[PDB]
Amino acid sequence: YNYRYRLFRKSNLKPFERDISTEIYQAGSKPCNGVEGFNCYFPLQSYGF
């Protein structure tokens, strides 16, 4: 699980955009405020290699 990717959050990256951020991902537009559940989840997903 050291190998990781984004699912969604918001709008796409621009070409060669170096994203580094680690704030909570929205599945929906709630005030997620560091709480996971419905609407809100961790900003990295990781491979079962």
Partner: protein, 112 residues
């Protein structure tokens, strides 16, 4: 008095930011999260790094395809305050593949 610039989106360690400084001996550049100067005064995990009224310094700062692009010119001037009414072309300086893109910026100033 003007020593450099800060560029980014949050400028506060939530994400990476571009720092450009002239230290009188050199020009020095980094992209980093942390703020040595959190506020624009300067005393008289970084993913990229680089080194190199009477006078008017002109710059164009421009940002495309993850490159940051700079053009410049110098001249002495004699107008009371304003940019002199006239024409002279700025020339390319550097073209840095930093991968950041910018919504907000600020300048840095030397103080006692």
């Amino acid at each position: 008095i003007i020593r450099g610039w800060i560029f980014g989106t949050t400028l506060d360690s939530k994400t990476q930011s571009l720092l450009i400084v002239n230290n009188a001996t050199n020009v020095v550049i980094k992209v980093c999260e942390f703020q040595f100067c959190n506020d624009p005064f300067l005393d008289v995990n970084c993913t990229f790094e680089y080194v190199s009224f009477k006078n008017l310094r002109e710059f164009v700062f421009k940002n495309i395809d993850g490159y940051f692009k700079i053009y410049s010119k110098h001249t002495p001037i004699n107008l009371v305050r304003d940019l002199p009414q006239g024409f002279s072309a700025l020339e390319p300086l550097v073209d840095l593949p930093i991968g950041i893109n910018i919504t907000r910026f600020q300048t840095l100033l030397a103080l006692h």
